[PDB]
Each structure stands twice: as structure tokens, then as C-alpha cells.
Paper text:
GIIE, the closest homolog to GIIA, is regarded as a “hair follicular”, “inflammatory” and “metabolic” sPLA2. Similar to hGIIA, hGIIE has seven disulfide bonds.
For hGIIA, Gly21 can neither form the hydrogen bond nor clash with these compounds. For hGIIE, these compounds present 2–24 fold decreased inhibition effect against mutant N21G compared to the WT hGIIE. Our results on the co-crystal structure of hGIIE N21G mutant with compound 24 also confirm that the inhibitor binds much weaker to the mutant protein than the WT protein.
Numbering used by the authors: 3 to 123
Write the structure that this text describes.
Amino acid sequence: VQFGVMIEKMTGKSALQYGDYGCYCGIGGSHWPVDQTDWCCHAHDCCYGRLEKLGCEPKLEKYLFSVSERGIFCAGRTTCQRLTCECDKRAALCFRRNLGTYNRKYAHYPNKLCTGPTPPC
Ligand SMILES: Cc1c(C(=O)C(N)=O)c2c(OCC(=O)O)cccc2n1Cc1ccccc1C(F)(F)F
Ligand SMILES: [Ca+2]
Ligand SMILES: [Cl-]
Ligand SMILES: [Cl-]
Ligand SMILES: [Cl-]
Ligand SMILES: [Cl-]
Ligand SMILES: [Cl-]
Ligand code: NA
């Protein structure tokens, strides 16, 4: 809900249009990212991994945020909530920054088409 809301506010698209994009947007991921938007998702997965290693549960954490002219402001009772917001913010900004190359053909991309090596974090 929260990340999805952040995606919608920052990109003008439905959350669903990122949730299953390329080889990395959506649960898990493998092989080489298809484009810059997909790289945002690779980085976001790495970000969540770092949070998991710190003892957080970023897949489950609920946080608070606002969007003004100054940008995305993150908040939350716990440090783990705020960290999760920071990973999400970076991803949502990355999506916005790459709207110019977003390609509808990579939404709901068949995972069978993901080829090549898996880049490290
Ligand atoms: C873009 C994205 C994700 C990523 O950024 C990613 N790197 O995989 C993502 C996600 O990533 C965490 C993971 O890969 O384990 C899990 C579920 C939905 C996700 N979505 C889509 C999403 C996000 C919030 C609310 C709804 C949706 C959905 F799936 F409906 F589109
Ligand atoms: Ca992923
Ligand atoms: Cl690329
Ligand atoms: Cl990151
Ligand atoms: Cl707001
Ligand atoms: Cl910002
Ligand atoms: Cl397009
Ligand atoms: Na703390």
C-alpha cells in the first residue's frame, strides 16, 4: 500500500505498472535488468537485503510519508520503518527520473525472457 502510494504520487502511473516490470520489479529477480527502470528495482531489492541484515523486515514494515515541493519526507516510530521508507523513496525517485525510457512492453514481462548474468549489489 505505502510503496504503491509512493509510486503513484511520484510517477503518475498506477502502482501495478511497476509491480511486475522487467526482471527485477516485483518479488525476487534474476538475470540482467532490462532497462534503467528495472535497475531501480535491482537496487531496491539490494536495499531491502541490507535492511534485512540490520534486523528489519522491510517487506512488512509500515511507515509514514508526505510529498511536498521539497520532496519526499519519511517518518515512522521505528528506525526500521524509516529505513524502509528511505529504500522506497530512492526507488520511487529512480522511477520518476527514468520515466523517459519506461516502456509498456516491459510491464508483465515473461520471466523466461530474463537472460544473462545476475549483477551483484
Ligand atoms: C515496484 C515493486 C517492487 C519493487 O520495487 C522491487 N524491486 O521488486 C516490489 C516488491 O519488491 C520486494 C521484493 O522484490 O521482494 C514486492 C512487491 C511489490 C513490488 N512492487 C510493486 C508494488 C509495490 C507496492 C504496492 C503494489 C505493487 C504491485 F505489486 F501491486 F504492483
Ligand atoms: Ca524484485
Ligand atoms: Cl539500462
Ligand atoms: Cl538503494
Ligand atoms: Cl502527502
Ligand atoms: Cl525527495
Ligand atoms: Cl511505452
Ligand atoms: Na534505533
